[PDB]
Amino acid sequence: GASKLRAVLEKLKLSRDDISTAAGMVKGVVDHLLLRLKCDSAFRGVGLLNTGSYYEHVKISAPNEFDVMFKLEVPRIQLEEYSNTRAYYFVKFKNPLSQFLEGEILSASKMLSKFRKIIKEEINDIKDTDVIMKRKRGGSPAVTLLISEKISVDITLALESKSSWPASTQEGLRIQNWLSAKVRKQLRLKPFYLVPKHEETWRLSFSHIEKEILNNHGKSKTCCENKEEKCCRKDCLKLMKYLLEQLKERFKDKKHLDKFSSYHVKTAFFHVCTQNPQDSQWDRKDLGLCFDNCVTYFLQCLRTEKLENYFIPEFNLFSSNLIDKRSKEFLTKQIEYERNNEFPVFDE
Numbered sequence: 001g002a003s004k005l006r007a008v009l010e011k012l013k014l015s016r017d018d019i020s021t022a023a024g025m026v027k028g029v030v031d032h033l034l035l036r037l038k039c040d041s042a043f044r045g046v047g048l049l050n051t052g053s054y055y056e057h058v059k060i061s062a063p064n065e066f067d068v069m070f071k072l073e074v075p076r077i078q079l080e081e082y083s084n085t086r087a088y089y090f091v092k093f094k095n096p097l098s099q100f101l102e103g104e105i106l107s108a109s110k111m112l113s114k115f116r117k118i119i120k121e122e123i124n125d126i127k128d129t130d131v132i133m134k135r136k137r138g139g140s141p142a143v144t145l146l147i148s149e150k151i152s153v154d155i156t157l158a159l160e161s162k163s164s165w166p167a168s169t170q171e172g173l174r175i176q177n178w179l180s181a182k183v184r185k186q187l188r189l190k191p192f193y194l195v196p197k198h199e200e201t202w203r204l205s206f207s208h209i210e211k212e213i214l215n216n217h218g219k220s221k222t223c224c225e226n227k228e229e230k231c232c233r234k235d236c237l238k239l240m241k242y243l244l245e246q247l248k249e250r251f252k253d254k255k256h257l258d259k260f261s262s263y264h265v266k267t268a269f270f271h272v273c274t275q276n277p278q279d280s281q282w283d284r285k286d287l288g289l290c291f292d293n294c295v296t297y298f299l300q301c302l303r304t305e306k307l308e309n310y311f312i313p314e315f316n317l318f319s320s321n322l323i324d325k326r327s328k329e330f331l332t333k334q335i336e337y338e339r340n341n342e343f344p345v346f347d348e
């Protein structure tokens, strides 16, 4: 019941000071890397993007894995969609990145190739810390570093565009009944970001918007600022991420749930905030019912084989192109069992 979930949340708090130390280790390495990068002409205007709850730039993703985004101010960007994918684009210009231009197009692989070299150079140069360097399979996390042989950080290069959001997002960010039309208009005036994921295509990124709507998450502007308005939205997201983490830990050898990530969990959770816009639907005292709402919607997404991207609704995260049908059935079976029996996975 709800007291079992509160105990899970209390136990997760116990690792708060360990996560803070690990994040501080990441911050020191990133800040060193930021210094060098600003010496290269192509990356002269690089800075850290405000995406996480540690300082402002280190984003927790899993127990000992962090995410960091370097933003690059790039003006006069023109986008051309790569064939009805809605998510992927070529980058044009109507400048420092001239070396990576092939025709009128900006090569993500050439820009990404130099980025890696500089970081790989500077990782070796100064070692008052044990820092190594991996290449994760997908190029969306551009570089992965391993600090003290425990902490891993994904570093992502992103182009910053101050232009109006692409037309594929016109029907996304469906927050009007929850956070208001005024807030939706404000958010869409902010920049958007382009990260090199696979041709030489770029994918849109809204990491800065996720942080904003997580930390300013109520219908009431004073949600969670006083004892009378304590909701459980953040705790429900934490429990959902931890549920997936704990289930994945049971299949270390086979990696049966390898295709599922906290990105999927977060997407479903923000759809549930859309569906349940009132702060009274997230009363802290209703933790058990609210968590059930989140789990039940996730199950529905698994069974209908459909999880819409929060910003580009025509992009289905759960299409069989991306996640095998049998993988979705397997996770459906695991979660359905956990829900029907009060989440034994959380038992001590």
Ligand SMILES: CCCc1cc(=O)n2nc(NCc3cc(-c4ccncc4)ccc3Cl)nc2[nH]1
Residues within 6 Å of the ligand: 086, 087, 140, 203, 204, 205, 206, 207, 208, 209, 210, 263, 266, 267, 270, 309, 310, 311, 312, 315
């Ligand atoms: C606030 C809700 C969660 C969220 C945060 C965020 O920063 N973003 N950024 C986009 N961009 C659009 C997009 C992203 C991905 C993706 C695939 C894999 N890892 C990352 C992103 C795949 C397809 C598409 Cl269309 N969506 C989101 N959702």
Ligand SMILES: [Zn+2]
Residues within 6 Å of the ligand: 217, 218, 223, 224, 229, 230, 231, 232, 233
């Ligand atoms: Zn709140």
